[PDB]
Amino acid sequence: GNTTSSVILTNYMDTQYYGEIGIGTPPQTFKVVFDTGSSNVWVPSSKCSRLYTACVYHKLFDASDSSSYKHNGTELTLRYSTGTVSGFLSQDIITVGGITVTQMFGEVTEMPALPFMLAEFDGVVGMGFIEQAIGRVTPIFDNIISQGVLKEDVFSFYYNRDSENSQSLGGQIVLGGSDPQHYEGNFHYINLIKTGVWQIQMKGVSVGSSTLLCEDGCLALVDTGASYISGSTSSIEKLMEALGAKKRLFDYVVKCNEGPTLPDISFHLGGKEYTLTSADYVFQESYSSKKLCTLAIHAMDIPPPTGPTWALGATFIRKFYTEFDRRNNRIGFALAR
Amino acid sequence: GNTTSSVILTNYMDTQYYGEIGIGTPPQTFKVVFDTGSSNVWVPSSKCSRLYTACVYHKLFDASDSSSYKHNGTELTLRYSTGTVSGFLSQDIITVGGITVTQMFGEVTEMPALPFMLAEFDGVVGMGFIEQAIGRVTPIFDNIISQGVLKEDVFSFYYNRDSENSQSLGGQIVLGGSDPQHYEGNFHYINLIKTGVWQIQMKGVSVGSSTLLCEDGCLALVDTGASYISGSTSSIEKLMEALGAKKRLFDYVVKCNEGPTLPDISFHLGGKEYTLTSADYVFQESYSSKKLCTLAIHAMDIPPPTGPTWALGATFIRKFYTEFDRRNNRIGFALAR
Amino acid sequence: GNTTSSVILTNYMDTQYYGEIGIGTPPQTFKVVFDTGSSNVWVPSSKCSRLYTACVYHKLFDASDSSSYKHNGTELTLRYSTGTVSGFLSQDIITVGGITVTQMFGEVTEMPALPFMLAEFDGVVGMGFIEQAIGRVTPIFDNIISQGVLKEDVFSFYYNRDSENSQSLGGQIVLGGSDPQHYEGNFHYINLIKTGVWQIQMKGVSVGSSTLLCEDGCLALVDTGASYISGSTSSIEKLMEALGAKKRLFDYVVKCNEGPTLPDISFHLGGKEYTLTSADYVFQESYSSKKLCTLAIHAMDIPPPTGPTWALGATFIRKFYTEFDRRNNRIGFALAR
Amino acid sequence: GNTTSSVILTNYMDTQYYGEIGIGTPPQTFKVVFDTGSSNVWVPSSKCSRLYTACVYHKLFDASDSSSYKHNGTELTLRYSTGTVSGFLSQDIITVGGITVTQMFGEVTEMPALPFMLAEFDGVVGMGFIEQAIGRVTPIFDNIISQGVLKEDVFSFYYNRDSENSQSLGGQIVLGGSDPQHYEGNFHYINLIKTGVWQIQMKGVSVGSSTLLCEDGCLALVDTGASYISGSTSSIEKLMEALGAKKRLFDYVVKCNEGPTLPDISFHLGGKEYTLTSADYVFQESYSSKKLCTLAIHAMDIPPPTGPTWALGATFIRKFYTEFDRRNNRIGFALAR
Amino acid sequence: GNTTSSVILTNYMDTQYYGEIGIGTPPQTFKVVFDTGSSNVWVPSSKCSRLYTACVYHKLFDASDSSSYKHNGTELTLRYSTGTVSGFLSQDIITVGGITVTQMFGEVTEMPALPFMLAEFDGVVGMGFIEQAIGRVTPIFDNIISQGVLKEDVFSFYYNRDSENSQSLGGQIVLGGSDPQHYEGNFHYINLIKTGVWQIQMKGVSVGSSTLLCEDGCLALVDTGASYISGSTSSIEKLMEALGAKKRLFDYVVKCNEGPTLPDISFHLGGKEYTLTSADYVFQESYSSKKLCTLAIHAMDIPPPTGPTWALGATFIRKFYTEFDRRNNRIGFALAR
Amino acid sequence: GNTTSSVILTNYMDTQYYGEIGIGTPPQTFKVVFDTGSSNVWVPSSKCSRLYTACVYHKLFDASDSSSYKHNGTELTLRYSTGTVSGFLSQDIITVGGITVTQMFGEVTEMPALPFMLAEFDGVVGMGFIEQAIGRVTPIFDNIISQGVLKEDVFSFYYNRDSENSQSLGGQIVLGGSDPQHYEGNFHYINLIKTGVWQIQMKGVSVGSSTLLCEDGCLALVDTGASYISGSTSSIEKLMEALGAKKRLFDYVVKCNEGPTLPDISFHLGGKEYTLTSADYVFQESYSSKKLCTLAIHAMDIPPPTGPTWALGATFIRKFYTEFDRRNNRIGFALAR
């Protein structure tokens, strides 16, 4: 085919990027994260008990109002690194940037206050492979490919820096290609270890003038649905010792004055070193020594079979425009602009 | 009749106002919000699972200790804009400022951590109409009227500013009239759209030198149980654009230095303009440009049938002593003092 | 009569105190300072040209929009110790906390950026005497006494300490009496040197253990429209030498840790000693040995006839609740609170 | 017997002290609090629904991986002052500082987000008496005594101050004796009211130069599992009035500048006055008057039969090395170092 | 050609702007300031002795690790208005936001602590002309024009205001064009006095309502490598007298509350008036009457031939987006945003 | 003997270090500074008249309430470099971290507000020699050596850096030895010029690269009771000129951003160079280019016989752990930590 579609994304405190989708007839709209680390679509349901306060604070899909609804009802539970949702499968029409696709999704009826009350978004649109689809449900991108309308069998992510401006675009997902207006230089590609996961070989991680981590190679999950760059607890302990960062419950911090002079961190991928400066990974909220500044690098032990692995989320993608190539099973990176 | 009673209220961070009631024989006491936006009485129950941490941190009604208790047991679920509680109905004797009334109330056994762990109060005394009573339970004020002891069929709210002083009264509810010691000038009255809800016509909302909102009239719910003044998401977006406020997850903020010079907001009700200054709607916690200050105006989409509507909570009532007149179905306002 | 009327006041940084008046049918609402150190009422005009950038940033009165406006047009200039305004005389209903009074006042058309860009208030309500009113315009309080509605022929001021951790009342003016909530004990009065100015005899100002200033007496204006306790340049020079304070560049300062070592300052007024501690006169913006802190006492050379005199502004009034007694031409003080 | 074992503890923000234990074959490790205020062992279970986000963020015991596991399955619910957990009993081998003991513990399958998401620890090792054991399960210390290997039938707690250093030990529990390297002077002992609870008579509590609390004697629970020193709501109101502290939802605060000069608090136990200075009970996070500082003394109404009682947690134990003597039923205190 | 290339810039405290370049095969990545006020490229060397403590704390280039390095060794000294570096000439591939260009540059071996310990950047990329290049080394932009890839023969600078409440972009340089996202309206250009320096004629500098400086004209360097607007010592002395500013010890200051009373400063350039308001030129680090605030205008006596001249640095560029037009030997300015 | 005894110390703002002693049977507990620069013990008395406002705000000793008090009554005056106390001699049991010793000390009855209102401690424990004890009262350490309980005849001081983000130990004094936890490596000792004062020969003070002060030698008192490193007025004048520091009003300051450019200060003591970096001697209260920062070095003209001399106070001791060796009349230093 010959079309491409983009969805404009909103950027929330540099930790959540989401766009809009419509479900049903007439469309009921939802803020959703386009997530390469999962493969299911779900949104909160009108059948979700209001004793789930997260459901009181989000848009709820109501099937009783949709003339295009198709019942299925199979239970499913979706497990993420920072929380779990549960509900049941339904089918309806979903619009994503002017593509209309019939799609099986989850109507979530159990949505925990922690963390979903901290979600600006309502739901999730998984962009992973069917291999990782819970309930063996066909993912939305596979369904869009079937239609034979996308110019290429790929999608791309631009994640902007946060703005205080209204007229700064938070991000952009292009279905069927890439926007050259938001990257420069050439794409450089790495092949997936295996089809089924957006995960690649990483040859090394260095902090300053030393490959002190991933010395014998390791795994990098490229996860548009993760806020941060994460690694294993023990990998991160080492990294954070070297930065002189202190561990809290959920994050690491440094004294704010120390932030700007923290060293570079490089990620060795497919023969190119991908390099973040301090400004790229420190929430420089102040310059005061009497204050604490969060780092956009966390600990997360992703379990087998996907893990143990590093994850390269928004912290990484803000620097590097990312293209997900399904036809050739590879990820490409280019300097974002 | 000829009596009136008042209940002294405590003011918590200007967002929660509550007084004491006694339930049972001997009395088991509870901190409760007197709430014109709902019509049921409830308090937390001894039957509430301690897996509900909100129940571990509040006073629990225990029916086994009350010789005046009368079982009913009908389930009920109470839905508020910021959360839900659930339990079952019971009857017992309730004292409110020296009035003793036999009252059906809810013993809540499901009380979500978010938001009820943020409640300084234990329960709620709904002061709305039977028309909005869940379970068609007679509300406490209707039951008090039946006794034929109140001088007038009205109640009134004084909500003070917050104090660092002990000896500042947080607020006052007068059952059966008004305290002229806490208002000045004359009351000015608006008739309810309909008996059944404490909701009136609002002719316009202006921000500075411009009626930019509610240009063709809209609805104002007068809600002693809401912290803030709220309006529809789209009404508020407009208001907040004009103030130069930025939206966060739950609130809007401005830079603190900008607070004092923010413009007036007026609310056109029954032929009088009701005007708040910045000091009335900004939590001026600092004057620093490197800090964020919350506004006591929020977004809340109240659904049909009551909504879509604005709500005029504590932010408004601190400025304006409010009388609720059931005999003549109207709300009156006067400058608080 | 048997009424009083109160206006709640905003405190800006302990240097500006102001509240709401209404002008016109229907009311246009302005922030004003209630100023016992002048005798005219004025607000900025719609006719104020946009050149003066202080008029773009303050609420403007619009005669065309008031059915009770009555033209006068007479020119007038108002000279304060810090800044001068010119404009013309207008008439209308001014509303001040429940009282409605017909009043002549200034529509200010010349509003110098220096200092009125610093003014958080729009205008000024002069509580001084007719003897000092420019244009011999009957001052507002005189006009309100003529109504015969006020219980006593006095008015009172409470100014509060500024607080970042509470949204307390910044202050209160009570027309027609006093509020026992904001003082303790009983008033002791000092008679005016003469009707016409709120000015009393002072019999000494001591610093710790020695009446080292104003032996042989001096004058004290009690000025609710002034931020500070002022004395003459020479007076304050000697006051600061006694305290160990030094001219930074613009203001006098102390090392913040040494503030609590500074001696009590005592103003001998009508037989009694009125004492401010260092906490009451130094802005303990911080307490460290590494910072400097300013004082709430400044040099002000007031010219004849009113000066040379001390002025007792906000600083003093914060400590001592003040009643201005027009019937008896005296001033009452009582502590706190 | 002749052995003693110690477990090194980690100190988290001075509010949680925990060490490591191993459960199962091969060992599955867990961070646990050694808690004299309870008598059960539990850790989170692999059977805990991932809709409990607290279970997503902690180490989960998985019985399917343990060749030493012994099923029992009896339900149990453990109620603490700040929350509840629920699950069922299992038996397995537990290692604590080189002692290996077969132990019945709780596999928790219900673990509320509030407060368990704020737990750095995974589980709890109750060190109380069988008398208070839920399910009449033999506590771990009783089981260790049975082995006849401990030199003395006692255990001891050292709780360090918090450090920014890695190489500062957070705390230490000695099984079978005391470490003289972490105390000085002599132990001074008080007998338990009764065997069954780590609770003693307290003869008085003084704040400054006045026994204003516990004037006629009261109860002190010595609780290694509580963060703070607590007393009854009414006892604490009085204490906090005297310190000039303000009550918030969960804690009390003072202005930070006021912290260092707050008076001493003494606790009269078995004929010695145990004295904390401000530095011992104030989280001195800043010296600024524009900031709030938490006190490590809270309100908690412990119910019958253990209560009403004061609790002496970490705030007290940091100052005083504590020995728990089971053979002679007593608690001993000595100055920590 | 038809390409542009952009480099995203970090803003440190509104006084240092810098971004990423790569040098060598494979790239070694350094932070650099893009400096229209000089014409050489340099980074610190591996050969830089560890004595100069500024070399221990900055990224060092290592020729031995680059397969595209080509020795030159020629000595060179670079004199800035604040500090001097010496070193030797090297050649390699420098990569600048998607463009790869072969370039001669300085390996700096002498790096004085004063001021380079204060330097958040490693090195400097000179965007000035060959006429002013030490050693007559072809400047990087000239070398990039020679590739014939850039769409136009210009480059542009956006410098942003620093913000603690957002992780916004600190700035952007676009090689080969301009980004309409960061200005509004259209450029107006001023021609260079002569090819060779980014220096234009200035026809007046007014303070409010009077061209009181630079009547009879003066020179203005537009210097992206300077923190401030500078003028000559005498010029700035008279500028500060007009503003009411005073020499603290090192810098000129105003009382923070009086900043908003300061007059607009206007630079008459090419027929148009370029105006900074007080918000644009004063560091409102705070707004209180109790604090002093510094200005973003400093005295700098630049020596011949380039000086004596005004310099328009970051302060100016923050207000006016700047395009440097090499084809036409002129400079474009447009507002904001 | 074979014991040591330690007292944990509170750090107030890096300028006052003090801990707990007990006096009387039963103990009355006072905060004291452990002062190697004086030789008497004193606390404030119950007999101290309430005039001296410093006595109302400090713990007072009450002889009437101690069964081990033994009257002496002899008058004594104690002159420190900053302030003077007078009072009378008393005897009692003083308890100091596990040691009980009978001691003669001062009951202070005259306690000048200047400077003792600034004193966070109640009293002083003189660790100097009998030769300098007013009234030739045996100093406390001598009395403790006479017990023959201490393992070695020395005592040691650890002073910590102040921290807002941790409740760390502020310091530690060890009587009878040293704590390897708070230094690294091994002590190197400097012999006393003579028994009787904790004063050593200094062979030079260099600023960066030049012994520009104290060539031809000078004296150094090692004073645990002084906040700073002091030198003579002339000495410090030349020291500050070399650093670029200037007299603000009261203290010397640097621009906070320029602190890290200041040279190492090195004190040549007993053959070795003891070096403080700028981090160790400047109070980096902030790091901005818009703020000024004070130094922890001050001018102090000490009079004969003890002076003129440098004093090495808290500033020095923070860097170098200090052991005072009474057996060998020398002082040991080791780094950190």
From Swiss-Prot, chains A, B, C, D, E, F:
One of its GO terms (molecular function) is peptidase activity. Glycans are attached at residues 2, 72. It comes from the Eukaryota. Its EC number is 3.4.23.15. One of its GO terms (cellular component) is extracellular region. One of its GO terms (biological process) is proteolysis. The keyword Cell division does not apply. Interaction with ATP6AP2 results in a 5-fold increased efficiency in angiotensinogen processing. It is found in: Secreted; Membrane. Disulfide bonds join 48-55, 214-218, 256-293. Keywords: Aspartyl protease, Cleavage on pair of basic residues, Disease variant, Disulfide bond, Glycoprotein, Hydrolase, Membrane, Protease, Secreted, Signal, Zymogen. It catalyses: Cleavage of Leu-|-Xaa bond in angiotensinogen to generate angiotensin I. Residues 17-334 form the Peptidase A1 domain. The active site is at residues 35, 223. It is linked to Renal tubular dysgenesis: Autosomal recessive severe disorder of renal tubular development characterized by persistent fetal anuria and perinatal death, probably due to pulmonary hypoplasia from early-onset oligohydramnios (the Potter phenotype). Belongs to the peptidase A1 family. Interacts with ATP6AP2. Renin is a highly specific endopeptidase, whose only known function is to generate angiotensin I from angiotensinogen in the plasma, initiating a cascade of reactions that produce an elevation of blood pressure and increased sodium retention by the kidney. This is Renin. It comes from Homo sapiens (Human). The gene is REN.
